[PDB]
Amino acid sequence: TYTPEEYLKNYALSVCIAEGYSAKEVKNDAAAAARGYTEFGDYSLEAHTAVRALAKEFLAKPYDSSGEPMTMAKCIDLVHSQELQAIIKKYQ
Amino acid sequence: TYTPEEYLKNYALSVCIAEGYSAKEVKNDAAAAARGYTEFGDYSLEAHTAVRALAKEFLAKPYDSMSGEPMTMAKCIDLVHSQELQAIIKKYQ
């Protein structure tokens, strides 16, 4: 199993990747993963929407890359961030 | 921001996402991220190639899905939390 916190972090990564790339292949796949972490998770739908909002905040940050958008790095930083931890502790 | 084990975990997820999806957009971006996470001050070249082998094994597993999507994202998440990845980290410590 994952813990509730780990599920909400998996959800964070999954929605971040689904939001941050345009390829339908990936949006659809990561979206289905995010739905699964929400259904097996314990956090409220509100906690989930605040995580999604935070993911968009991270994706909106301009990273210096290589010429790549560095989405992958933004989503990894999101999962590791003090900001996501604050959301977890607001709701826990 | 990251210990060397957290970097190797970031590498693992990046290479898994680069390997796991067809789309060049995501492939190029995730591969570029994996290069950034590649360091050899605590994890050898061989530690990395074992991480990549393990990612490809995770991607090879069939996952059930009510959506009919392959669940690549879930496979890669499972990789990063796997005992097999921990064993790599311990071995090459």
Numbering used by the authors:
A (entry chain A): 27 to 91, 93 to 119
B (entry chain B): 27 to 119
Sentences from the paper on this structure:
To prevent self-harm, these bacteria also produce highly specific immunity proteins that neutralize these antagonistic effectors.
Rap2a, like Rap1a, is predicted to be localized in the periplasm and could only be produced in soluble recombinant form using the E. coli Rosetta-gami (DE3) strain. The structure was determined at 1.9 Å resolution with four molecules, arranged as two dimers, in the asymmetric unit. These four molecules, sub­units A–B and C–D, are similar overall, with r.m.s.d.s between superimposed Cα atoms ranging from 0.6 Å (subunits A and B, residues Thr27–Gln123) to 0.7 Å (subunits C, residues 27–127, and D, residues 27–126). Minor deviations from NCS are observed in a five-residue loop between α2 and α3 (Gly67–Leu71) and indicate some conformational freedom in this part of the molecule. The ASA of a Rap2a subunit averages at approximately 6110 Å2; the range is from 6140 Å2 for subunit C to 6090 Å2 for subunit D. Dimer formation occludes an area that is approximately 20% of the ASA, which is indicative of a stable association. A disulfide bond between Cys42 and Cys102 links α1 to α4 and interactions of other side-chain groups on these elements of secondary structure help to create the helical bundle fold and in particular to align α2. Together, α1, α2, the α2–α3 loop and α4 form the dimer interface, giving rise to a twofold NCS axis, and a combination of hydrogen-bonding, salt-bridge and van der Waals interactions serve to stabilize the association. The side chains of Leu39, Ile43, Tyr47, Val52, Met99 and Ile103 are involved in van der Waals interactions with the partner subunit to stabilize the dimer.
